Amino acid sequence: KLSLNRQFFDERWSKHRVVSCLDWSSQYPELLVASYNNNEDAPHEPDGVALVWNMKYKKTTPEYVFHCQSAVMSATFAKFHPNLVVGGTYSGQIVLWDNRSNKRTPVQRTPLSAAAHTHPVYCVNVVGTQNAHNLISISTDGKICSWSLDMLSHPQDSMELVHKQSKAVAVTSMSFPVGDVNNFVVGSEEGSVYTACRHGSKAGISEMFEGHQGPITGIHCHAAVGAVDFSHLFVTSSFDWTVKLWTTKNNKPLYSFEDNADYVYDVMWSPTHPALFACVDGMGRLDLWNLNNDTEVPTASISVEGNPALNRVRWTHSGREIAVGDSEGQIVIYDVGEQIAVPRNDEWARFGRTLAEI
Amino acid sequence: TRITARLRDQLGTAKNANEMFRIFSRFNALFVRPHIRGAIREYQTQLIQRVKDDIESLHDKFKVQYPQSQACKMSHVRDL
Numbered sequence: 039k040l041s042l043n044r045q046f047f048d049e050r051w052s053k054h055r056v057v058s059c060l061d062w063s064s065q066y067p068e069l070l071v072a073s074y075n076n077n078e079d080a081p082h083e084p085d086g087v088a089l090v091w092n093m094k095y096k097k098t099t100p101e102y103v104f105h106c107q108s109a110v111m112s113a114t115f116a117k118f119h120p121n122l123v124v125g126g127t128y129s130g131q132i133v134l135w136d137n138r139s140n141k142r143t144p145v146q147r148t149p150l151s152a153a154a155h156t157h158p159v160y161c162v163n164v165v166g167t168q169n170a171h172n173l174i175s176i177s178t179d180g181k182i183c184s185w186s187l188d189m190l191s192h193p194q195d196s197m198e199l200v201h202k203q204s205k206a207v208a209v210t211s212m213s214f215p216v217g218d219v220n221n222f223v224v225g226s227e228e229g230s231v232y233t234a235c236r237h238g239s240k241a242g243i244s245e246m247f248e249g250h251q252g253p254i255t256g257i258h259c260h261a262a263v264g265a266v267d268f269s270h271l272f273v274t275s276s277f278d279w280t281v282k283l284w285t286t287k288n289n290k291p292l293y294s295f296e297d298n299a300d301y302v303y304d305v306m307w308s309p310t311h312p313a314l315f316a317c318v319d320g321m322g323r324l325d326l327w328n329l330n331n332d333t334e335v336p337t338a339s340i341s342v343e344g345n346p347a348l349n350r351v352r353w354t355h356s357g358r359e360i361a362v363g364d365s366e367g368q369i370v371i372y373d374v375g376e377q378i379a380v381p382r383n384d385e386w387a388r389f390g391r392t393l394a395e396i
Numbered sequence: 397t398r399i400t401a402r403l404r405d406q407l408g409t410a411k412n413a414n415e416m417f418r419i420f421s422r423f424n425a426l427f428v429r430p431h432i433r434g435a436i437r438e439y440q441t442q443l444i445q446r447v448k449d450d451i452e453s454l455h456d457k458f459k460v461q462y463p464q465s466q467a468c469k470m471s472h473v474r475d476l
Contacts, residue, residue: 169401170435186438194438237434 040324040340040372043359046070046091047368048100054079055087057363060352061114067355068093069101071123074367075109086110086127088135091369104135105142117164118171119187126159132175132190146190153192155183161212165219174236176224180207184236199224201232201243213259215269223286225257225274233286247289252278256304261353262312266386271393273315275305281317283329293333293396298325303349310357311381313389318348318362328378330388333396338378342370399426403435413446 047053051074058073069092076085084105092101108127116122116134123135125144132155133144148154157177164187166172172194173185180200183193199207211225220238225231229250232243259272270286281295281302300321308314313330314337322345328337342348346364353360357379361371403426406419416439426432436443462468 167397167401169397169404172438189441192441 039375039378040326040338040360041375042370043373044093044371045369046072046089046098046100046371048089051087051089051100051103051105052367053077055367056365057350057367057369058110059112059114060350060361060363060369062352062354062361063115063120064117064355065120069115070352070361070369071113071115072350072363072369073110073113073125075111075128086125086133088113088123088125090123090137093371102137103142104144106131106133106144106147108133111158111160112162114162114164116187118166118168122187124162124164124173124187126155126162126175126177128158130155130157130159130177132159132162132173132185134187134190148185148190149192153196155181157181160210161224163212163214165214172219174212174222176209176212178208178210178227180209182209182234182236195237197242199232199234199243201230201246207232207243210254211257213257213272215259216261216263218269223257223259223272225254227253229254229276229278231257231272231274231284245286245289247284249282249284249291250274250276250278250280252276255302256306258306260312261307261309262357262381264312264381264386266312266390268312268389273305273307275302275317277301279319281305292393295327295333297336298323303347304351306351306353308357308379309353309355311379312386313392314378314381316351316353316360318351320347320349320365322346322348322364324348324351324360324362324372326374326378329392330385333392338374340372399423400432400435403432407439413443413450416443416446 054077055074061071063069071090074087086106086109088104089100090102108129110125113125121137125133130150132148134146136145155177157179159175159177162175164173176182181198184195185193208227209224210227214222220236231247233245234243235241255275257274260268274282279298283293298319300319302319305317314328316326318324322341324340325336326338331337346366348362348364350363359373363369410416
């Protein structure tokens with residue numbers, strides 16, 4: 039069962055804004071960074087805002103505030119640079135904020151030249167080892183650019199992604215397998231996922247999937263790692279109310295969930311439990327599905343008070359808590375019951391048998 | 397992977413164009429592998445801008461007219 043643990047809402051900053059993205063810091067698992075676009079009600083205010091809240095303290099105030107002239111479509115923590123928060127904005131500038139600096143404006147922002155991004159950036163990530171780390175960002179024009187966190191003047195690498203007949207792929211979401219850095223997966227607005235390669239002979243889009251018949255809202259790869267590997271699996275939410283469970287090998291749906299009577303706006307695996315995953319829709323419902331227990335009904339369900347349309351969801355690293363941001367700039371945190379979140383030793387084999395069944 | 401980490405650390409030390417080229421040249425054999433070429437591309441922008449800074453330094457030395465430069469005086473000292 040889901041228990042309401044903590045709600046974050048800043049009257050001055052977060053009010054009358056959508057929550058654009060969410061992330062939890064690895065080195066600080068009790069730190070949550072969230073994004074907010076422009077507020078129509080406050081044109082004079084900064085368009086983009088990014089607030090970092092904390093869970094160890096019970097103070098309601100935002101631990102850190104940041105803002106920028108362009109609306110922040112995406113944000114995340116810098117995994118190997120704990121002082122740094124990366125963000126992608128509406129205009130396409132990859133802004134960066136240092137918590138040490140008292141300044142709220144980005145310390146760095148990429149150019150929006152032809153070399154750099156030239157469209158809204160909805161997905162940014164830092165992938166690599168502690169020795170080697172790369173900031174992959176993709177825009178809505180299909181341009182994918184790798185940057186160094188130390189220099190955002192010009193990208194490490196840059197190209198444009200196509201799949202057939204040089205047709206631009208308007209990428210809307212992106213994910214990686216655990217431990218992998220060369221191969222990645224992107225969910226476009228086509229309703230078509232693409233397994234793509236960053237670098238090598240086959241760099242670009244490698245495969246098409248037909249799949250969803252509407253825009254993909256979120257794509258997320260399997261995170262839990264254990265006895266039986268499931269990194270080849272991933273999940274895709276879309277505007278079509280449907281949540282599709284896929285794998286790299288098969289080109290067609292392994293399964294599709296359509297219990298939702300609304301646009302399903304995000305889907306995400308648990309980082310510990312292999313079969314469990316979560317999704318959030320715009321009617322105001324957060325739903326946990328445990329494919330070991332059932333590929334048939336939500337294993338758990340919860341509605342935020344007033345049923346605000348839930349936009350973004352992010353699992354905590356421990357997998358014991360889920361955070362969700364709605365269309366009112368209001369964050370809700372639910373602690374998952376130990377019975378669901380904690381995987382038993384047989385949950386891996388149970389999910390293997392379930393995958394064999396389908 | 398160990399030497400890729402060493403490359404990262406070694407450039408974390410060196411900043412100068414000449415020094416960075418030196419530590420680059422330290423790994424003569426690693427140019428063959430098409431994995432550390434990505435690591436090199438990651439610093440390539442910094443490499444061109446450093447070699448740039450060097451060549452504007454050389455242009456600063458050049459744009460000084462040679463008779464006005466100390467080089468002419470030392471040359472005349474050695475009867476050149």
